[PDB]
Amino acid sequence: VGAXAXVXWXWXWXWX
Amino acid sequence: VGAXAXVXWXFXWXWX
Numbered sequence: 001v002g003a004x005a006x007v008x009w010x011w012x013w014x015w016x
Numbered sequence: 017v018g019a020x021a022x023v024x025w026x027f028x029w030x031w032x
């Protein structure tokens with residue numbers, strides 16, 4: 001849990 | 017739904 005890649009908040013593919 | 021900022025897959029903060 002923290003910063004980098006995976007899932008959650010920020011840039012890439014999903015919803016916003 | 018798609019690419020850009022928000023929740024889902026990618027970079028930033030959350031789970032690896």
Ligand code: NA
Pocket residue numbers: 007008009010011012013014021022023024025026027028
């Ligand atoms: Na995200």
